[PDB]
Each structure stands twice: as structure tokens, then as C-alpha cells.
Write a protein that binds this ligand. Structure first.
Ligand SMILES: Nc1nc2c(ncn2[C@@H]2O[C@H](COP(=O)(O)OP(=O)(O)OP(=O)(O)O)[C@@H](O)[C@H]2O)c(=O)[nH]1
Lengths: 97, 87, 94, 77, 72, 48, 80, 80, 536, 81
């Protein structure tokens, strides 16, 4: 969907490129054979999983994976992202240190 | 021979003598063919009846003109793992 | 596959190839005029859209000129050389 | 039946072309049409005779398989 | 107005025709049948070479490729 | 299956009792991603 | 112009055309086209056979000239 | 179609005349859907030339004019 | 003793390639085939990763990680660590167009940072043609304009490649219709640059013009219109003339499924065009099925794509699985080979244009005609503008383009510095050529001779070559002139002064200055009248 | 393209180079194959025609119909391709 935070696709002064489409009279007769069809015609463009699957692509690791080798419980360092990123602005002396 | 895949892959690269409908004899290492029976001869030579030999390059013969072809000569020619023991 | 064979059989019952159809089933000799200016007189046992024929008890005659001939017990003739198939008036249904 | 891609000849269109045909006829003129069989259309066509004579033709259609060699008089466009 | 070959030969089918082969010989007879490939079957057919008849052949089949022209 | 000891180990989502490889779908991955949330960062990290 | 559309002009205009035969270099056919098919067989009308080695002529009338035998078809010159 | 009869004639001995007048005799080791015939233990008698013995010979099928078939051949069983 | 001087990757052996080296070396004798190209970009557009796809196709042994770009043409360890490209590197590869005719390509991966843009100048001197890489989200930023503009001024032939298209579907999530408009606007931006800066008839960059292609080097996607039409033609089986469909796959045109004709008025209020239906929606459906479903859809993806995935490939994640699905379905980049082959013109046609721009000498009778012929039998002339250092940094090899005659290893040659003229002539030396190599960034193929039109890496002549150099036949009795210096697209504005704590070591520092001066080209070394040693 | 046979693929790789082809009428044409087709129509440039009597002439461009070509001598590097 076109998220309104995405700025519109327009530049007001921009000259539109010439499109060398085929000229009508003979070329309009040209027809695509009756069984030629978009590669995924009837597969829907998106499902109710798709929104979640796209969100997972930029989940923090490990959640951007879906297949993985398994890891020991001692190795998952559950809080480690918290101290890597930064102190919150409000936390006092003890915690900052 | 040809098209029978187990057999065709062995009949390529033979040195074959090709007879054409104009009466020419070509000789070369036959190493590609086509459904139209076009043939591609590497290191080719021609013999013209009168006999005289001329050296050609890689020669593509359009299949329409072949009468017949025959084997002239063989393709060119040239376990391995162990080491457990000591002596 | 079999639809093309069915198509091939249907054309023989009506087309110009009826003469080959009659030659087989009534065993009537055809004097096939052929390229290289040679005549083959014999009975067709099978033929096709390409006008191949398998021939039995062939007499081959031609002008060399002087006449020469050869007897061929059985033959397959590639129909590309056939000019003109004459349902032979010098023979009859057998 | 078979499907054949249109020949490359579009770069030769409306340029002056010589042709050598079966039976060693020499034909010349402005090539301005072809088809997948290379049935040429030669406009303002001219015949060159094997005795050295020449005769103007009309707008001319040539059956493709009679064409042996075709040869521009001018650079390809 | 067009007179296309298959209508033309159908209009000749069952009628007398002259058939010329590509190699200097002519067969005149009743065109009994024609097919999509335009093989020709002639009946009561007679062989003409250099403008002269030289014999009745009866029913003859002329294979498609041999024909230069055929007509009434 | 969430609170089993070795979850899924006897199922097609993990190679077997040695418990060395896993391959979850998206319905599974998005659900546990959502449960994990309280521990996870907000970031599209690398530039921050 | 294509080729088939050009032969349609001979058909529609009934233009007197001269046909060159294939390997038969010493004969040409003159007449009017009255029809053709996808194989370029020509149903040919008022057809004459011209022996250019002598300029002798024979008149044949309406014929099917098989398209296999055609080298060239062109609008006839003023010769008759 | 009748070409599928010939490929049942594997290992039969035949005498072949080609369109060029070459006479070839030998045993069909195999012949294909285009009647390209592959022969073993082959003699080629090119026209007005002495016969030459050959081990193998592949003939492009359109060059075949006719194949003389062996006399015992059970035509009534192969033509089904 | 085993000093860990290693500052760049260098391959311990010649890696395997799909083409034979002998066919590459033979094709070098035939400039009527070969092309030279430079790839030029804003920082971190597709450019390096796209060449890794060309590497992966030709090589087979070329490992690309599922996590991160291999960036084969970014050989230096500073470039590995920084991950921007910092210096140009050349590739030479044999690659097939849509006809499966085999072309020889030489390609420089120019760095996208403007500070490095001096590297783009040296590359464009070699290039003949440029491919410009635009990022489907960012579009034409700063260096993209500078790359196009500077390529025009060189008189390169300019071609466009729109790159990281996947950003439209995955990150921006623009639908199909708006994704087409975003691509359309990028093309319009570039043509707006071309029409203002060219003033001459530099050719308009539509897809209908097929001088434009679309790519995602992360996902092995690269297609023009014709390669996508060939996919429909192969898939359905030549039921239509594929070039006639390709003409209709872009712009304001629509497919009327009632009639199967193509119409230019929107057949409904909502109708997707051609590009949206045929090109974009299958791409969105490839990604969205693997992104959303993976577990369930993947057998159906095998059926319509006819691709096979083994069960351990079906357990790949999304990025490697989509990249594998696209790799098998699209196959090689040949749409890009079409782009290069048709638009760029070879050495031979371009050699007239390139000698007029580069040469400085009297651009008329004797020597300039031998170069404009690009005749491999003519008198030797080589132009060089790069210096690459050997793995011990003891010496440089110079990188060169030949177009007169043939350059031969272990022969003697006349090397002309940037000042040489009939008055300056002391600025020339006779050098003995060492080995000659063809360079494929990390690895070098060694050859006895290189003929006009090729690029070459030359051993042993590096001592007098300060930056650019001309190399010329000794026996040529007529006047030889040097090719121009590099007319850089920027200036060295920042001055830095260098002084060692060690000053008895100052002679070692000056040798450091000479070596960097050779490596950089735009870096200017001064010794001021104050005695300061200065870098610019 | 569709999988046309190897001889036609080699013919398109021959487009860069000089080829020498003989026509069914006997004339030998040497020139630089500028376009070829899957029906093996050939366009030659910078051509020299050699007649069957041994006379020769230069020709700037030649188009030869594919079914009138007897054979072509291709260059050796194509054996590597
Ligand atoms: N999302 C997305 N990112 C990509 C894609 N291709 C490349 N990138 C990313 O962009 C960054 C730069 O890629 P490079 O190949 O190094 O780009 P680059 O332009 O060669 O870098 P420089 O030439 O030095 O400017 C890396 O993080 C890549 O992962 C893509 O197709 N999709």
C-alpha cells in the first residue's frame, strides 16, 4: 500500500520521456496467443501472511531467519542488545556505569 | 549409432570421411551434428576425384548436401586413490 | 498419435491415393514410373501419405539405348522418386 | 507446417539491390518488401540479360527460393 | 473476383484436364480426385509427349511434385 | 507446543532428537517474534 | 508493400503479368492472374507460353501454375 | 506411417541404391525416423568406380532411392 | 621473515570458469566482438554487487554468502573493512547475449563516493561506454548526476541500469502500479540530465529504446523487456514473436483480455498496464509468496516456474531462497550483455571518437589513423591510467588500454611521461616490458601478447610512470605524442602536512609519498618552499 | 533462444570473424559474417567473391540465402567455444 509517509512520486518540472509505442493501424491488430498469461495470474498479490513475512525481514536476528541451526541455552544472551545500544537518557548513576 | 545417446556420444569425435552430393570427399574430426543432419568437422581436409588433398579449417557442412559418411580413424587419445599403507 | 493415424487412414479412402488403396486390397499390379527414367511394375503391400511403397515380385524395365531389365523379389521404394503410378492395364486383380 | 522468424532484411529496405536468381538471371532494383519466405518485392526492377541486353520490369515479386545471392549497391542504412 | 486453386480444382474435379509435368511430358484425362497436397489422379488418362499421343494408360496417379501446370 | 521441553523435536520442523536444525514457517516465526517483543530492540540497527 | 498484397493488385486490377518459370530458363508464361493460395500456386488466365529463344507462342488458357515453378512475376511490358 | 516398418528391419541384410547411383550393400544396424540408414559390414560401389569395402556407413535418408529387402522377410507380421 | 604485508586479496590459483581461457585469449584478437565498459554509481547503489552476479555466473566456484555481499572487485582490505569501493578494479569475462553468441567484456567497477571520483575519471578514459546504476528507492542522487555528466563530457556512450528494484517491493512496499511510476520517474530524471547537459543527440534512455535494464543484484534479478518476453516465449513456446511483445511491455499501453489486443486507453478505471501485469506482478508474486508463505506455497512455485528445489534448498531462508528462485528462473544476466553489446560500440567504432578526445597529437595523417583503425598490426601505442601495487608493495603494475598494434612481453618499449613533447623529450625512457597480464580483480591471467582494443596489466615499466603514461614503439620514426592527462571532475581542496618523528627516516617517508602519488592520481604531493611535505 | 542445434550456435559465434563459404552454384565467398540466422542465411561484409574459374572480385556486402550455401570454413577459435 502507498504509505502516506512515503512522499508522492512526482517532480513537477520533470519532462516526461517519449514512449516509442507501436503505431496503431497494423500494430493494433497484433494479438497475444490465447493461452499466454501472466506468470502468476491467479496467485493473489498478497495474503494475510505476507504483511507479517515482510515485517520479519527486518526483525532483529534471529527473527529475520526462518531456518537455523540450534544454539545452546547458555549462548542466548537475552539482555545483550540492551547494553549494546545505549543508556536511556533517564537512568541514574549506577545503571549508566 | 547416432541419436541413440549411449551410442551417439561415442560416435562423435571419430575421424570421419564425408561424401557430398557434388562428389567431394571431406575428411575431418566429426564433432557436432544437428536434427537437420548438418555436421561440423574439425581440422577438415578435402579430397577431390580426378586425387588431390587440400587443408581446410573448421568446416560446417549443411546437411542437405551429405550423401553419406564413414569412419576414417579413431578419436585422438591420451584406480588412483589409496595411501593407507606404508612399506 | 492414434488420431494422426486415424487421419491418415481417412484420407486414403477418398483421395487420389485410392489407386494405391485398390492396388493393395485387390492385389492389382501398378507400373510405377520412377525417376532416372526407370519403370517398376509390381504389387504394393503398403504405402503412406509420402507415397512410399513396399513392392513384391517386381519386374524392373528401362531403356539404357537398349532395353534392359532386372527381377527384384521384394523392395522398398522411397516415394520421392515416384513420378507416376499407373494402375497397370497389362495386369488384373488377383 | 512450420514457424519462421522474419528475416533480417529490414536494414536493406528501400535501398537498391542486385539479385542473382536460379537460371543465372540478374535482376536489379529497389527492394521494398519481403515476407518470412524472403519473397522479395523489387520496385522499378530492371533485368540484365545474359546477351548483355536489358529490359525494364514493373513492380516485381520474386519467389524467395529462386533468389541465390542478393547484394546491395549502396551501404546498409 | 478471386478463383482460388482449391475451388478451381474442385470445379475441374470430374472433368477433363491437361496435366503437364515439369520434364517435358503431358497427360490428358479426367481429373477424378485431388487432395489438400494436390496429388492428381486421372482416369481414362492418355500420355502425350511432344504433342503426340502414344498410348492409353487407364487410371494413373501423378505425384504432387511432378506437375508444372494443370488446366482444361 | 511452546512450553514443551525440546519443542517440536519429534516433528518436521526440526531434524530430530539431536535437535540441531530447525525450519519454522511464517505463522510460527511471526507469533514468537511478537511474544519475544519485550526483549527485542526497535532498531534497523546498523546506522544507529 | 508485401508480396501477397502486390499479387492482390494483379488480381484486383487483372493486370497482364509475365511469369518466369523456375529452372526452365527458355520459357515464360504471360497472362492474367485470377487467384492464388498460401502456397503461391497461381490460377492463371488467358495464359500463353512464350519461347523467348524464338519468340514463338502457344496459347493454353486457364491453368493452375504450381507455385513451386515460379521464379518471378511482374507486370508485363508492352510486348505482345 | 511406413518408416516405422524399416526400423523393425534391424540386422537384416539389404542392397541399397542411392539417388546418386551409388550402390551400397550391408547389414542395417539401425535406421531412424528420417530413414537415415546405418549399415555395418558395408561395400560401396560408387558408379563407374570399383567397390570399396567399408566397416560402417551412415546414409542421409533422403539419398535412399530403394532398399531391396531380403526374400524371407515376414511382411505380414511387420506391417501391422 | 614471513612478513604479513598482505593488504589485498590475491588468488592462489586461476579459478575455474565456464569459458575456456583459450577462448577468452582468442576472442581478444577480435575487437568486432569485445566491449569495454565502466560501471558508475552513487555510493552504495548496486554497482559492486551486480558484478558479483557476473562473477557467480561465469565462475561456478564463486562463493557468495547468504548474509553479505562477496564484493569480488573490492579486493583491498581497506575496501573490505570500509565496504565502500575505494579504487577501481577491472574484470574480464566472456558472457552470452540473448542469442547465446559469446561476447568478451572488460568492466571496471568505479567507486561511488565522490571523493573517489578521480577513480571514475581514470576508468572512463579506458571505458568506451558507461552503465549508470540508479537505486530504485534513492533515484538519481549526487554522484549519479556527476557520473552521467562526466561520462557525456568524455563522449562515452551512456546506458542505464535501475538497480535494487527489490527495495520497491520489500522496503517501500509500493504496490505494482506505483512501483512502475517510481521507475518511470527515475528514467525521466536521467533523461532530464541528458537533454540539458548533452545538447547533442545523446540517445534517450527508455526501455523501448532498450538501452535501460532493471536489476536486483541481491536477488539475481536482471531483465530488460526482451529477456522477460523471451521468458514468456520459452515458457509458452514461441507461440508469438517475442520482439513484438517486448515493444509493448512499457509505457501507457494496456492488455484487453476480452480481445487480446493492446490498447492505449485504460480499458477500465483500474487496469494495470503491460509492464505492471507481465513484469511487475510476477515479481511481486515471486517475492510475496516466498516472503509470506515459504512453508506452503513453495511446491506451486516449482510448478509454474518449473525450477527444481531440493528439500534442503526449500529450508533456505527468504533472501537466499528468493535469490535461488530468481537465479534458476531468470538464469544469467544476458539482458545486461544485450545492454552493453548494442549500445556501447566496441573499441573499433569508438576508437575514432576516443582518439579525438584523448590523443593531443595532430589528429590527422599517420599515427592517429593507425589508432583509429585500431589495427592490431600497427605501431604499438598504449595508454595507461592506473597503478595497482604488487602484493608486497615493492612496485606497481600499470593498467593500460592498447589501441595500435600489439604489446608483447619481454620486449622493449618507449615510455612517455605526462610532459613529453618535441621540446620536453627528456621525459621519455626505454623500458623492458615484464610479464603481461589480463586482470580479473583478485586474479590475473598471464598472456604473451595483447592486441589493440584489449586492456592489459603491464609489469616492470612502472618506475617513471608517475600517473598517466603513454607507451610507444621504439622504431616508430615519426613524431609520437602523449595522450592527455586526466581531466578530473573535481579538485583536491583539502591540504594535509606530513612530518615524521624519525627525521633520519624522512627519506623513507618520501618513498611513501611517491608510491601513494602513483596509486591515487588526484592526490597531489608538494614540498612547499617552507619545506613542509604536503598531501592534497 | 530455443535450443537450436550446436552447428547453428557455432555459426552465430562465427559472426565476429572471417568465414569462407561456397554456394551451390560453385562460387566461393570469403568475408566477415556480419549477421547469420538459424536458417543459416549469411550476410557477409568486406567480401571477396572467387568464381569457379579462379577470377576474383571485391564486394562490399553479400546476402546469401541459407539453403544455397554448401559449406562454410569457420575459424579455429570457435573450436574452444
Ligand atoms: N536491499 C538491497 N540492498 C542491496 C542490493 N544490492 C546491494 N545492496 C546493498 O547495498 C550495499 C552496497 O552494495 P555494494 O555492492 O557494495 O554497492 P556499491 O555501490 O558497489 O558500493 P560502492 O561502489 O563503493 O559505492 C550493501 O549493503 C548491499 O547489501 C539489493 O538488491 N537490495
Amino acid at each position: 500500500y502507498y504509505d502516506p509517509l512515503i512522499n508522492p512520486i512526482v517532480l513537477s518540472n520533470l519532462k516526461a520521456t517519449e514512449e516509442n509505442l507501436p503505431e496503431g493501424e497494423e500494430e493494433d491488430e497484433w494479438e497475444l496467443p490465447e493461452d499466454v498469461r501472466p506468470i502468476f495470474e491467479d496467485v493473489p498479490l498478497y495474503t494475510d501472511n505476507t504483511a507479517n513475512g515482510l515485517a520479519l525481514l527486518w526483525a532483529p536476528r534471529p527473527f529475520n531467519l526462518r531456518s537455523g541451526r540450534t544454539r545452546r541455552a547458555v549462548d542466548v544472551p537475552l539482555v545483550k542488545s540492551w547494553y549494546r545500544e545505549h543508556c536511556p537518557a533517564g537512568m541514574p548513576v549506577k545503571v549508566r556505569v | 549409432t547416432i541419436s541413440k545417446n549411449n551410442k551417439m556420444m561415442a560416435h562423435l569425435n571419430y575421424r570421419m570421411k564425408i561424401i557430398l552430393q557434388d562428389g567431394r570427399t571431406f575428411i575431418g574430426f566429426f564433432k557436432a551434428f544437428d536434427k537437420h543432419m548438418n555436421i561440423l568437422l574439425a581440422e577438415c581436409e578435402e579430397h577431390r576425384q580426378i586425387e588431390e588433398k587440400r587443408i581446410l579449417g573448421l568446416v560446417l557442412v549443411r546437411g542437405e548436401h551429405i550423401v553419406s559418411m564413414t569412419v576414417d580413424g579413431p578419436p585422438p587419445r591420451d584406480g588412483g586413490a589409496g595411501g593407507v599403507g606404508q612399506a | 498419435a492414434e488420431e494422426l493415424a486415424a487421419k491418415e487412414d481417412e484420407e486414403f479412402n477418398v483421395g487420389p491415393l485410392s489407386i494405391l488403396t485398390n492396388s493393395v486390397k485387390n492385389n492389382h499390379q501398378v507400373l510405377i514410373n520412377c525417376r532416372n527414367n526407370k519403370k517398376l511394375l509390381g504389387r504394393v503391400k503398403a504405402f503412406d501419405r509420402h507415397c512410399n511403397m513396399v513392392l513384391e515380385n517386381v519386374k524392373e524395365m528401362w531403356t539404357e539405348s537398349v532395353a534392359k531389365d532386372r527381377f527384384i523379389s521384394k523392395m522398398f521404394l522411397r516415394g520421392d522418386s515416384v513420378i507416376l503410378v499407373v494402375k497397370n492395364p497389362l495386369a488384373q486383380a488377383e | 507446417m512450420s514457424k519462421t522468424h522474419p528475416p533480417e532484411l529490414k536494414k536493406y529496405m528501400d535501398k537498391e539491390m542486385d539479385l542473382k536468381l536460379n537460371g543465372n538471371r540478374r535482376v536489379s532494383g529497389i527492394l521494398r518488401g519481403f515476407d518470412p519466405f524472403m519473397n522479395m518485392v523489387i520496385d522499378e526492377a530492371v533485368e540484365y540479360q545474359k546477351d548483355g541486353g536489358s529490359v525494364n520490369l514493373g513492380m516485381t515479386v520474386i519467389r524467395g527460393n529462386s533468389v541465390v545471392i542478393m547484394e546491395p549497391k549502396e551501404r546498409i542504412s | 473476383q478471386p478463383v482460388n486453386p482449391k475451388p478451381f480444382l474442385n470445379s475441374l474435379t470430374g472433368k477433363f484436364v491437361v496435366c503437364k509435368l515439369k520434364w517435358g511430358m503431358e497427360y490428358k484425362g479426367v481429373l477424378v480426385a485431388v487432395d489438400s497436397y494436390m496429388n492428381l489422379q486421372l482416369a481414362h488418362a492418355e500420355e502425350y509427349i511432344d504433342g503426340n499421343s502414344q498410348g492409353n494408360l487407364g487410371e494413373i496417379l501423378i505425384r504432387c511434385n511432378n506437375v508444372l501446370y494443370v488446366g482444361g | 507446543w511452546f512450553y514443551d521441553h525440546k519443542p517440536l523435536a519429534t516433528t518436521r520442523f526440526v531434524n530430530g532428537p539431536t535437535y540441531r536444525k530447525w525450519a519454522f514457517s511464517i505463522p510460527q516465526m511471526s507469533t514468537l517474534y511478537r511474544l519475544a517483543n519485550q526483549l527485542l530492540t526497535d532498531l534497523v540497527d546498523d546506522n544507529y | 508493400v508485401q508480396p501477397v498484397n502486390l499479387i492482390f493488385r494483379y488480381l484486383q486490377n487483372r493486370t497482364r503479368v509475365q511469369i518466369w518459370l523456375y529452372e526452365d530458363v527458355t520459357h515464360r508464361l504471360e497472362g492474367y492472374i485470377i487467384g492464388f493460395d498460401e502456397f503461391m500456386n497461381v490460377v492463371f488466365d488467358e495464359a500463353e507460353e512464350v519461347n523467348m529463344k524464338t519468340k514463338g507462342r502457344n496459347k493454353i488458357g486457364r491453368i493452375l501454375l504450381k507455385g513451386d515453378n515460379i521464379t518471378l512475376i511482374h507486370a508485363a511490358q508492352q510486348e505482345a | 506411417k511406413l518408416v516405422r516398418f524399416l526400423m523393425k528391419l534391424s540386422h537384416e541384410t539389404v542392397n541399397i541404391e542411392l539417388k546418386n547411383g551409388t550402390q551400397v550393400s550391408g547389414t542395417i544396424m539401425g535406421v531412424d525416423v528420417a530413414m537415415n540408414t546405418h549399415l555395418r559390414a558395408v561395400s560401396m560401389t560408387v558408379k563407374n568406380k570399383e567397390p570399396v569395402k567399408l566397416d560402417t556407413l551412415s546414409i542421409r535418408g533422403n539419398n535412399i532411392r530403394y532398399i531391396i529387402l531380403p526374400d524371407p522377410l515376414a511382411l505380414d507380421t511387420l506391417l501391422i | 621473515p614471513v612478513s604479513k604485508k598482505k593488504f589485498q586479496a590475491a588468488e592462489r590459483f586461476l579459478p575455474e570458469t565456464v569459458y575456456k581461457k583459450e577462448y577468452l585469449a582468442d576472442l581478444m584478437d577480435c575487437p568486432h566482438i569485445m566491449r569495454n565498459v565502466a560501471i558508475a554509481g552513487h555510493l552504495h547503489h548496486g554497482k559492486t554487487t551486480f558484478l558479483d552476479c557476473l562473477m557467480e555466473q561465469t565462475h561456478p566456484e564463486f562463493y557468495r554468502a547468504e548474509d553479505a555481499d562477496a564484493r569480488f572487485t573490492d579486493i583491498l582490505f581497506i575496501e573490505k573493512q570500509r565496504g565502500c569501493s575505494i579504487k577501481s578494479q577491472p574484470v574480464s569475462i566472456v558472457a552470452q547475449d540473448s542469442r547465446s553468441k559469446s561476447y568478451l567484456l572488460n568492466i571496471i567497477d568505479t567507486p561511488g563516493h565522490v571523493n573517489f571520483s578521480d577513480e571514475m575519471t581514470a576508468s572512463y578514459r579506458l571505458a568506451d561506454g558507461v552503465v549508470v546504476m540508479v537505486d530504485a528507492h534513492e533515484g538519481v542522487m549526487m554522484n549519479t548526476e556527476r557520473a552521467i555528466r562526466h561520462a557525456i563530457q568524455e563522449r562515452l556512450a551512456v546506458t542505464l541500469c535501475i538497480s535494487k528494484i527489490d527495495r520497491l517491493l520489500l522496503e517501500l512496499k509500493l504496490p505494482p502500479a506505483d512501483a512502475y511510476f517510481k521507475l518511470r520517474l527515475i528514467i525521466d530524471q536521467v533523461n532530464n540530465i541528458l537533454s540539458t547537459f548533452a545538447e547533442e543527440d545523446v540517445p534517450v534512455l527508455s526501455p523501448l529504446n532498450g538501452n535501460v535494464i532493471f536489476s536486483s543484484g541481491r536477488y539475481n534479478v536482471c531483465f530488460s523487456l526482451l529477456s522477460f518476453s523471451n521468458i514468456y516465449a520459452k515458457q509458452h513456446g514461441d507461440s508469438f514473436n517475442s520482439k513484438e511483445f517486448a515493444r509493448r511491455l512499457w509505457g501507457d499501453i494496456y492488455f484487453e483480455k476480452k480481445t487480446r489486443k493492446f490498447v492505449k486507453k485504460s480499458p477500465s478505471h483500474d487496469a494495470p498496464r503491460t509492464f505492471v501485469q507481465f513484469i511487475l506482478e510476477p515479481m511481486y508474486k515471486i517475492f510475496s509468496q516466498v516472503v509470506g508463505d515459504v512453508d506452503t506455497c513453495l511446491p506451486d512455485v516449482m510448478a509454474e516456474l518449473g525450477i527444481r528445489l531440493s528439500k534442503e534448498e526449500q529450508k533456505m531462508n527468504v533472501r537466499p531462497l528468493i535469490a535461488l528462485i530468481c537465479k534458476r528462473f531468470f538464469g544469467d544476466f544476458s539482458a545486461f550483455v544485450d545492454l552493453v553489446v548494442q549500445n556501447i560500440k566496441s573499441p573499433l567504432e569508438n576508437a575514432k571518437t576516443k582518439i579525438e578526445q584523448t590523443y593531443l597529437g595532430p589528429a590527422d595523417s599517420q599515427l592517429a589513423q593507425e589508432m583509429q583503425k585500431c589495427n592490431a598490426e600497427g605501431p604499438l601505442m598504449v595508454h595507461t591510467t592506473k597503478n595497482y601495487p604488487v602484493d608486497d608493495a615493492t612496485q606497481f603494475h600499470v593498467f593500460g588500454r592498447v589501441m595500435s598494434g600489439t604489446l608483447e612481453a619481454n620486449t622493449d618499449v618507449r615510455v612517455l611521461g605526462e610532459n613529453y613533447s618535441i621540446q620536453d623529450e627528456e621525459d621519455c625512457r626505454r623500458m623492458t616490458v615484464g610479464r603481461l597480464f589480463v586482470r580479473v580483480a583478485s586474479y590475473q591471467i598471464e598472456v604473451s601478447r595483447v592486441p589493440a582494443g584489449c586492456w592489459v596489466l603491464i609489469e616492470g615499466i612502472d618506475q617513471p610512470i608517475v600517473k598517466t603514461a603513454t607507451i610507444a614503439e621504439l622504431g616508430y620514426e615519426e613524431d609520437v605524442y602523449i595522450f592527455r592527462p586526466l581531466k578530473f571532475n573535481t579538485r583536491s581542496c583539502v591540504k594535509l602536512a606530513v612530518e615524521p618523528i624519525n627525521p633520519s627516516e624522512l627519506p623513507k617517508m618520501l618513498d611513501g609519498l611517491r608510491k601513494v602519488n602513483k596509486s591515487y592520481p588526484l592526490l597531489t604531493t608538494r614540498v612547499e618552499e617552507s619545506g613542509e611535505h604536503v598531501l592534497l | 533462444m530455443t535450443s537450436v542445434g550446436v552447428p547453428i550456435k557455432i555459426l552465430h559465434e562465427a559472426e565476429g570473424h572471417m568465414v569462407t563459404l561456397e554456394t551451390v552454384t560453385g562460387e566461393v565467398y570469403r568475408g566477415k559474417l556480419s549477421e547469420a540466422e538459424d536458417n543459416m542465411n549469411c550476410q557477409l561484409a568486406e567480401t571477396v567473391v572467387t568464381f569457379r574459374d579462379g577470377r576474383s572480385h571485391q564486394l562490399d556486402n553479400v546476402f546469401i540465402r541459407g539453403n544455397k550455401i554448401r559449406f562454410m570454413i569457420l575459424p579455429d577459435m570457435l573450436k574452444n567455444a
